[PDB]
Design a protein around this ligand. Structure first.
Ligand SMILES: Nc1ncnc2c1ncn2[C@@H]1O[C@H](CSCC[C@H](N)C(=O)O)[C@@H](O)[C@H]1O
Ligand SMILES: Nc1ncnc2c1ncn2[C@@H]1O[C@H](CSCC[C@H](N)C(=O)O)[C@@H](O)[C@H]1O
Ligand SMILES: Nc1ncnc2c1ncn2[C@@H]1O[C@H](CSCC[C@H](N)C(=O)O)[C@@H](O)[C@H]1O
Lengths: 1058, 53, 106, 53, 53
């Protein structure tokens, strides 16, 4: 019992002006000048000219005499705006000027002027008997009471009814009317019962429950095909009036029920009337409402005929056969009972019927607004699948779905230029290891680096990464700019790549003027210029940490040894144009003016001299080692003495080469030299191209040589030919719970009817998915899914398929998303370095676990059910020990997963590991259970106490990962620091709280008297390739320089002891 | 980074459940929850939904 | 619709719970179905010193000749009123008045 | 304001929540709830500083 | 209605541009559904058997 309420009051009757004010609101509207009253919008559809007069000039029909002459015609036939805003205001004024109605000024204050009938007669020139009546006595149109307005124009004529054509709101749509109306003479209640029984068996007519004026009037349609456009138009409104009532509010739409009642009619509106008179459960809407509606509702009416379900069908069929009575629903009927006693003597539709059975809804949920929904699928649900179909899809097209790859990326501005400096560590080069390192370099050189490594090397390049964006700030440069500021990182950037010509500075800040009519060409950048512009900066950063320089003092000379003919010189000359006198020279063994063609070093004489030298010598395939070496070593020694602070470049950083480079410098030169190699950004990731910066010491160098060689090691991991190139691909096919699929991704389209059938199966291969419909009424849904081995290893544990069919089936038809135009999908995704580092972390341990004799269980401590991949076989039990995580559903489905909701400890108080338990200790031996930070002397106990117990436990490997000290300073002198930031005292990796470092010299030493077995294994290249190939993940370019250093100094120590 | 999630979402909003099965590693500095709806269920079942959010 | 802001303490909280519940109390005052929705309306009619009128407001127009006749009676139901003539020589005066129970009781 | 939740009042408060929930809030209270909304209050003005913009 | 069909662009626009004058372009007037195919190659096999050319 809710019985909602409302206010019922005629909305047309209370529009007619007063009989003594009707004068004012018609002609004397020449004083004001319109402006806001009428509504006008213009679309270049084209074309649309929706000029619509509002009250009191609404529902006003136009006479064909004063329609075309005054206004309407000419303004329309511009036609194409055009259409000055002045034209509408001034011209419409001219029309509204010369117009008036016949009326008599009265004195009684309780009279009203009949607008509708008055303007009807006027517009027809009083030709008809109905319009002539109001000429001899124009005072007939004054009335004090509705209904009695019309009673006076049936008795005076002797006629039974008056037919009147309708008004079209749009005044430029000069077409025949869809229908007209007819007003009947009916005084009392007993007359309406007589007339409505006469309306039967007559062409095409309709009514609508109650009426405005308390007098029966009906609708008469022109043709059968133009009736459903009117029924479907009213039905839509009733669905909105009861939407606010059923919840409970305040409405003012009199009548109560908007739905039309078909009297004598066809057979298409009897089906339409039935489906509308039961208030379907379109919630959310669905239905396909926007368009066409007039055909969507006809398909809807077909639903309830067989659907869905039971007495719902019966109700439908009890209305289809009848469609002669007004069907209401208790609560909605009460509105008439409430207002029939508030004012007696008012006509309603005689024939009513009341029912109380809705009964219920499904219900549904969806949306029909632009968008492209992403999905996230799980491995559990409330349904049970067995032996299902293979839902096949194919044909993507090239218009809707475009498939490409590099991938293009988006970064910042200053991040384009950064580097990481390394430092030697060794002080002696043994004479017994000088030929051991040689043998490694000689044996390795013969066979070029892995073929699998070269699958990404020359496939993608920095040019293809940065240029796309770099040439978009070119368009920005044009016409547009702000405060630039000389010297800045933005300065030399827009001076270089954006503009071929020079740049004039006025005030050191402004950019002016503008390109009047000549468009300056975009500076043609090259592959051998991007490496030089990022190294020029590094050269200035190595000189002094003081930022904001970039320009040199007058009378400074820099020379490049290319890599000719290449630009670079022009770029580093135009930049140093404004600053007094600077000399930028270029030389090489393939050069062109102004670059000078020479050899290296070149015969005696010529007297080369400069302040800085940047050497880029190398190429071009090939020569045997014994001859290649003599060429590489000869380049270094002829640039070290050529300048005071030079930088050289070598290939094959093999720890023999780098040591032979130093050896050949320490002997010749006096007071030795100080050397250190470095990587820079924009150097084509995994290209094993290091650079060697040389400084004339300052006294005597401590550690000139290299020992373990960290940055070099990357190179010394390549192997000969092996298996296969792998290479991702597509499938366009889905089996149900069947193993063995090649890495990559697949996509297509399916029938919306079986859309949720596909979604129930995609969960076996991937976690992410994307769907969208092309158009609202295509019924085809496009699907893209991506295969991840992080989910495969979690899907195929046992036999349970379950899944959640019920969940996804609640989308059909609509709710899968709508998207127009074209969209481009890529292949190699984009991941940071926090994720890839871990992909190397687990790619390592996987090799170690799946090799040992026997296993009982694999135990992880800390995570989100992560590191599932690496558990081998899948038959192996998997145990998780962490304080915070989700349980139950995932562990109930016989996945061999179990979780202990207790905080682990490292005190050797309660250890119980036993035969064959493989423990992982990722990052949980660092900070606190909450997220604070722990000392560096309290983390050592987490190894001492694990070992102490492990000593007695039967061969039980423990895998421990911890940070290596030395980073302190190694990432302090670097210029790249976007990530892996160091907060003076602590390392700030990702988020968390900055953590303390662990002195590796002490951590290793302290385990040489307690522990027994402890092998430290660092992730190497092979793990990077497999990681990127399986997942399909590109390297983050500027994060690639981060990876190949950060990777090294996170040791994974394997404690496999018995 | 401004992320949006819900049980009726559309790109760039991500369609998920709450809390959602394990894995996926939700993480942020601030969370604003507006969960609720949409009629209806008895108290003993409603309570278990409100308290779980 | 209240909101709950959660903070990881800073030490140990003194008074975590609610007792009387002030802001919540607002909710705990609703009752089941009772009488009627009330709902304001209009009258367009004036009796002289006669009790029993529904809450709301009423308005219309009268002959200027008996304009001050109406004003003498409106004082029984309201305190505020608004009048205006449409045009200088219409002789019709529009009146709006609003019923207040603060005046009915007086 | 409170520091203790009595075990004798933990089921007294429950009975109030359970008995109340069954019947939705007053019908008279809902005469203003979904009748007027903030949107209808602030938007009118909020879209006039659009014209100012 | 079938989601696994493709429209022959090349042959379709060839006929249109010639006003369906030739036997090859007239074929696709009486039955314009001939230009729908699910498999390449089979697109053309249908317009040699139907003509005899
Ligand atoms: N002493 C020397 N002997 C031979 N070639 C030298 C040299 N010094 C520099 N070079 C040149 O350096 C180049 C190595 S590759 C340089 C890149 C290339 N110029 C480009 O524009 O992409 C070789 O082509 C070689 O001609
Ligand atoms: N006694 C204990 N031993 C091992 N790990 C623990 C522990 N107590 C808590 N942890 C876990 O250690 C983790 C520290 S944060 C680790 C990263 C986080 N899991 C992520 O996904 O980003 C927490 O997740 C916590 O659940
Ligand atoms: N865990 C969960 N389970 C179900 N629905 C959830 C949910 N978390 C959020 N929601 C969503 O939150 C909504 C509560 S009402 C939200 C307002 C509505 N989205 C609007 O645009 O006006 C529900 O529609 C529901 O779909």
């Amino acid at each position: 019992m809710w019985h909602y309420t409302s206010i019922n009051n005629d909305t047309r009757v209370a529009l007619d002006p007063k009989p003594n004010q009707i004068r004012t609101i018609t002609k004397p509207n020449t004083v004001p000048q319109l402006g806001t009253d009428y509504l006008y919008t213009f679309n270049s559809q084209r074309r649309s000219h929706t000029l619509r007069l509002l009250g009191p000039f609404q529902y006003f029909n136009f006479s064909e005499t004063d329609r075309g002459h005054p206004l309407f015609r000419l303004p329309l036939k511009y036609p194409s705006k055009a259409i000055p805003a002045d034209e509408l205001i001034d011209n419409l004024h001219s029309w509204m000027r010369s117009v008036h109605l016949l009326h008599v000024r009265s004195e009684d204050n309780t009279l009203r002027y009949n607008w509708m009938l008055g303007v009807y007669a006027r517009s027809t020139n009083y030709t008809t008997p109905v319009g002539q009546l109001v000429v001899n006595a124009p005072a007939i149109l004054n009335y004090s009471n509705p209904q009695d307005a019309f009673n006076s124009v049936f008795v005076a004529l002797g006629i039974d009814y008056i037919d009147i054509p309708i008004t079209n709101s749009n005044i430029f749509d000069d077409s025949s009317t869809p229908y007209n109306v007819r007003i009947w003479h009916a005084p009392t209640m007993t007359e309406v019962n007589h007339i409505l029984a006469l309306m039967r068996k007559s062409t095409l007519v309709s009514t609508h429950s109650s009426w405005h004026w308390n007098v029966l009037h009906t609708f008469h349609y022109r043709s059968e095909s133009d009736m459903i456009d009117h029924f479907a138009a009213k039905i839509l409104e009733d669905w909105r009036q009861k939407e606010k009532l059923d919840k409970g509010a305040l409405v003012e739409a009199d009548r109560v029920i908007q739905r039309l009642i078909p009297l004598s009619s066809s057979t298409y509106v009897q089906r339409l009337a039935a489906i509308g008179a039961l208030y379907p459960n379109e919630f959310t809407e669905n239905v396909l409402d926007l368009s066409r509606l007039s055909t969507a509702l006809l398909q809807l009416s077909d639903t309830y005929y067989q659907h869905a379900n039971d007495q719902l069908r019966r109700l439908y069929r009890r209305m289809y056969n009848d469609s002669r009575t007004l069907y209401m629903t208790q609560r909605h009927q009460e509105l008439l009972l409430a207002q029939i006693t508030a004012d007696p003597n008012i006509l309603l539709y005689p024939y009513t019927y009341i029912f109380t059975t809705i009964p219920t809804s499904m219900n549904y949920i969806s949306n029909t607004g632009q968008g492209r929904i992403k999905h996230s699928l799980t491995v559990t649900g409330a349904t049970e699948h067995d032996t299902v179909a293979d839902i096949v899809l194919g044909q993507t097209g090239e218009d809707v779905i475009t498939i490409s790859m590099v991938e293009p990326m988006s970064i910042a501005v200053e991040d384009m230029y950064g580097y990481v400096l390394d430092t030697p560590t060794r002080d002696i080069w043994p004479a017994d290891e000088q030929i051991e390192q040689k043998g490694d370099a000689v044996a390795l050189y013969d066979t070029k680096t892995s073929r699998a490594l070269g699958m990404f090397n020359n496939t993608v390049r920095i040019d293809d990464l940065l240029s796309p964006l770099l040439s978009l700030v070119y368009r920005t440069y044009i016409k547009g700019d702000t405060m630039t500021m000389t010297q800045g990182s933005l300065d030399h950037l827009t001076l270089c790549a954006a503009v071929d010509s020079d740049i004039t500075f006025v005030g050191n800040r402004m950019i002016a003027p503008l390109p009047e009519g000549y468009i300056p060409k975009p500076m043609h950048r090259n592959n051998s210029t991007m490496k030089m512009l990022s190294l020029y900066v590094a050269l200035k950063k190595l000189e002094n940490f003081a930022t904001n320089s970039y320009l040199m003092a007058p009378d400074t000379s820099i020379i490049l040894l290319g890599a000719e003919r290449e630009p670079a010189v022009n770029i580093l000359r135009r930049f140093n144009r404004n600053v007094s006198n600077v000399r930028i020279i270029g030389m090489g063994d393939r050069a062109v003016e102004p670059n000078i063609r020479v050899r290296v070093p070149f015969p005696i004489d010529k007297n080369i001299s400069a302040d800085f030298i940047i050497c880029d010598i190398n190429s071009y395939e090939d020569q045997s080692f014994e001859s290649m070496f003599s060429e590489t070593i000869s380049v270094v020694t002829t640039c070290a003495s050529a300048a005071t602070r030079a930088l050289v470049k070598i290939n094959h950083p093999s720890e023999y080469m780098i040591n032979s480079v130093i050896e050949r410098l320490s002997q010749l030169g006096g007071v030795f030299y100080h050397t250190a190699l470095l990587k820079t950004a924009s150097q084509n990731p995994y290209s094993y191209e290091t650079y060697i910066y040389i400084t004339p010491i300052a006294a005597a160098v401590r550690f000139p040589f290299y020992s373990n060689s960290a940055m070099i090691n990357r190179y010394m991991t390549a192997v000969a030919d092996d298996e296969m190139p792998i290479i991702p691909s597509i499938h366009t096919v889905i089996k149900g719970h069947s193993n063995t699929y090649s890495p990559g991704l697949f996509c297509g389209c399916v029938d919306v009817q079986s859309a949720p059938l596909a979604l129930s199966q995609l969960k076996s291969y991937c976690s992410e998915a994307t769907t969208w419909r092309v158009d609202s009424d295509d019924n085809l849904v496009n699907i893209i899914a991506r295969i991840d081995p992080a989910r495969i290893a979690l899907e195929f544990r046992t036999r349970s398929n379950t899944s959640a069919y019920h969940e996804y089936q609640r989308y059909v038809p609509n709710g899968l998303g709508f998207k127009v135009r074209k969209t481009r999908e890529f292949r190699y995704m984009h991941r940071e370095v926090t994720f890839i580092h871990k992909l190397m972390m687990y790619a390592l341990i996987r090799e170690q676990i799946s090799l040992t004799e026997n296993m009982t269980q694999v135990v992880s401590i800390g995570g989100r059910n992560l590191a599932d991949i690496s558990v081998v076989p899948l038959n192996m039990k998997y145990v998780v020990i962490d304080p915070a995580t989700r349980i139950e559903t995932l562990t109930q489905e016989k996945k061999n997963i179990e979780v202990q909701s207790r905080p682990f400890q490292f005190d050797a108080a309660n250890m119980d590991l036993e035969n064959n338990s493989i423990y992982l200790f990722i990052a949980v031996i660092m900070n606190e259970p909450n997220g604070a930070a722990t000392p560096a002397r309290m983390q050592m106990d987490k190894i001492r106490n694990v070992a102490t117990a492990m000593l007695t436990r039967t061969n039980c490997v423990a895998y421990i990962s911890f940070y290596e000290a030395g980073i302190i300073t190694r990432l302090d002198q670097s210029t790249a620091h976007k990530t892996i930031r160091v907060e003076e005292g602590r390392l700030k990796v990702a988020n968390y709280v900055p953590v303390d470092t662990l002195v590796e010299a002490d951590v290793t030493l302290m385990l040489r008297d307690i522990g027994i077995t402890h092998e430290i294994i660092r992730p190497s290249t092979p793990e990077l390739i497999d990681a990127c190939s399986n997942y399909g993940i590109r390297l983050g370019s500027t994060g690639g320089a981060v990876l190949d250093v950060f990777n090294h100094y996170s040791p994974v120590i394997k404690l496999v002891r018995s």
